UniProtKB/Swiss-Prot annotation, chain A:
GO terms for biological process: carboxylic acid metabolic process; dicarboxylic acid metabolic process; glyoxylate metabolic process. The lineage of its organism: Eukaryota, Metazoa, Chordata, Craniata, Vertebrata. The gene is GRHPR. Ubiquitous. Most abundantly expressed in the liver. Coiled coil: none annotated. NADP(+) binds at G157, R158, I159, R180, Q181, P182, R183, I231, G283. Enzyme with hydroxy-pyruvate reductase, glyoxylate reductase and D-glycerate dehydrogenase enzymatic activities. Reduces hydroxypyruvate to D-glycerate, glyoxylate to glycolate, oxidizes D-glycerate to hydroxypyruvate. GO terms for molecular function: carboxylic acid binding; glyoxylate reductase (NADPH) activity; hydroxypyruvate reductase (NADH) activity; hydroxypyruvate reductase (NADPH) activity; hydroxypyruvate reductase [NAD(P)H] activity; NAD binding; NADPH binding; protein homodimerization activity. This is Glyoxylate reductase/hydroxypyruvate reductase. It comes from Homo sapiens. It is linked to Hyperoxaluria primary 2: A disorder characterized by elevated urinary excretion of oxalate and L-glycerate, progressive tissue accumulation of insoluble calcium oxalate, nephrolithiasis, nephrocalcinosis, and end-stage renal disease. The modification Phosphothreonine is found at T286. GO terms for cellular component: catalytic complex; cytoplasm; cytosol; extracellular exosome; mitochondrion; peroxisomal matrix. The modification Phosphoserine is found at S31, S260.
Swiss-Prot record, chain B:
The gene is GRHPR. Belongs to the D-isomer specific 2-hydroxyacid dehydrogenase family. It catalyses: glycolate + NADP(+) = glyoxylate + NADPH + H(+); (R)-glycerate + NAD(+) = 3-hydroxypyruvate + NADH + H(+); (R)-glycerate + NADP(+) = 3-hydroxypyruvate + NADPH + H(+). This is Glyoxylate reductase/hydroxypyruvate reductase. It holds the Pfam family 2-Hacid_dh_C. The active site is at H281. Ubiquitous. Most abundantly expressed in the liver. GO terms for molecular function: carboxylic acid binding; glyoxylate reductase (NADPH) activity; hydroxypyruvate reductase (NADH) activity; hydroxypyruvate reductase (NADPH) activity; hydroxypyruvate reductase [NAD(P)H] activity; NAD binding; NADPH binding; protein homodimerization activity. Substrate binds at V78, G79, R233, D257, H281, I282, G283, S284. The keyword Methyltransferase does not apply. Its EC number is 1.1.1.79, 1.1.1.81. It is linked to Hyperoxaluria primary 2: A disorder characterized by elevated urinary excretion of oxalate and L-glycerate, progressive tissue accumulation of insoluble calcium oxalate, nephrolithiasis, nephrocalcinosis, and end-stage renal disease. The record marks E262 as: Raises pKa of active site His.
Length: 313, 315
């Protein structure tokens, strides 16, 4: 029997997998709220394996607390920059994470966020409830359509490719993309042209970061009728610059699944704007996906605690 | 000169086209608010042509008010139920409308509605605003994705196809279509199987009505985890039935672009349910599309005054 600590109540499919392992003795923080460092720094002590969430920061400070005794840390996220991973890939400890399995879902949410923003749905929902809807009106609540539009994707990775793929049949006539290295073969499916950052800001009607670059200079160069979407990290957006551009007309509207910090305080300037949709990082929030993440995180942990190779390391 | 009456302030492109027409005098209800029936009557009096909106119920009372002079009714809409066609046909009056021009934009909204409903965007937006967001939680605000799913399209016409076209790349495994007659030629594009009404409701994960059919019998056969979406007309939904379904968890969620009546009273039951999203009939609401609808409705009218072939005429 081996010591296994899980930081949070995880979706069933991962819990079942771990419950079926006669191999381990699993101790669980039976709560939906993120366990604080104080309880985590006694939780991991003497643990061969730990299953932890995006919330938890695993550092030289917690890795010591665990000691040589820990062989595997499995995290239930594609996101990596919360684990000290070069103190880790350090101690010869093996790391688990959950990529690819959330791709279609996040790219779906990105498009869902994009659509809801440009077609002005939240504002539309509110007018119905507040009494703004009086009749059918020709020029009322008009949005911006994807037909004959130019879309720019900052970060044409596996995730961004899934975005263009979904946007293609919406009558998009031109895809533009930018990044560190140009991707030739994966761009040909949508005929995505590789351009400079200024050019992408200048030409695009919609901009999606699928990766702080996105600041005042970037927002000035954007079309006044353009829509800006970000699903990657919060720290790529300069949030004061975003507020200033949205409030003064430099850009039409913005949609954010990620923010600085997370969560955003309820009294944040961006939340006082009607042309700014904010979501609480729901990119991968579906039953199917959260379950598969759970199970993929569970199998990674077990594979490591035993000695086998992993599905995702 | 031929009198023309416009029941509303229409987009510039159509409004301008009317102004340029030398053989006409354009009189207009200069407002974005709907014209009351009492005023419409005084407005159409001796008018040779009428440009109306789906809001204006052009019936016998109004047709009487106009008189012999009336030759054309051009409506700025694809939907036509607001016109009393039987009596219009009886007087030999020509009718123009606006199909096609709005196919893509309306398809666009339908997918928008679907995506925002199944991924619980409105519920999530409110949760950031009211302090419900405390941390990344692995089971919170979880919705239903379109990957490997089954989609059911009721009334697979031109809009129906356009919805399907856009939904394919979301990794949907099977499509199902329903009508009064099968459409095999124009539906090979998605491998859509033609099924009956009741057989669809049980098999599909997402249903889209595009064109009181949808009632307590209809929502019972649907999956516990299914999303209902309507963008056609209000009449096809039994709204007290839909509420019973959503509240009891018989179906997962619902999103509407149309209701009975329009607008809905702000005190309606449905508007209190978290898992029900209501949009104020905004299918075609984009600057460019409405502006084009406006232009076509104007061209329909002028040709119907001059006795010329109309670009888009209802028979």
């Amino acid at each position: 029997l081996m010591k296994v600590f899980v930081t949070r109540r995880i979706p069933a499919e991962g819990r079942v997998a771990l419950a079926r392992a006669a191999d381990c003795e699993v101790e669980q923080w039976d709560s939906d709220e993120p366990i604080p460092a104080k309880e985590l720094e006694r939780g991991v002590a003497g643990a061969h394996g730990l299953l932890c969430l995006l919330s938890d920061h695993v550092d030289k400070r917690i890795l010591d607390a665990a000691g040589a005794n820990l062989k595997v840390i499995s995290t239930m996220s594609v996101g990596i920059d919360h684990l000290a991973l070069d103190e880790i890939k350090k101690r010869g400890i093996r790391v688990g994470y959950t990529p690819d399995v959330l791709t279609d879902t996040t790219a779906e949410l990105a498009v869902s966020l994009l659509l809801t923003t440009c077609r002005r749905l939240p504002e539309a929902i509110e007018e119905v409830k507040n009494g703004g809807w009086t009749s059918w009106k020709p020029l009322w609540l008009c949005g911006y359509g994807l037909t004959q539009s130019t879309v720019g994707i900052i970060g044409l990775g596996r995730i961004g490719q899934a975005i263009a793929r979904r946007l293609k049949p919406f009558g998009v006539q031109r895809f533009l993309y930018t990044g560190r290295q140009p991707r030739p073969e994966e761009a040909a499916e949508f005929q995505a042209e590789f351009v400079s950052t200024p050019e992408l800001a200048a030409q695009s009607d919609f901009i999606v970061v699928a990766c702080g670059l996105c600041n005042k200079d970037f927002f000035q160069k954007m079309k006044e009728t353009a829509v800006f979407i970000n699903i990657s990290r919060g720290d790529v957006v300069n949030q004061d610059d975003l507020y200033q551009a949205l409030a003064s007309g430099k850009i039409a509207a913005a949609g954010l699944d990620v923010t600085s910090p997370e969560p955003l305080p309820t009294n944040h300037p961006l939340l006082t704007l009607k042309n700014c949709v904010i979501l609480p990082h729901i990119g991968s929030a579906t039953h199917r996906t959260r379950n598969t993440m759970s199970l993929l995180a569970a199998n990674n942990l077990l594979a490591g605690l035993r000695g086998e190779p992993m599905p995702s390391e």
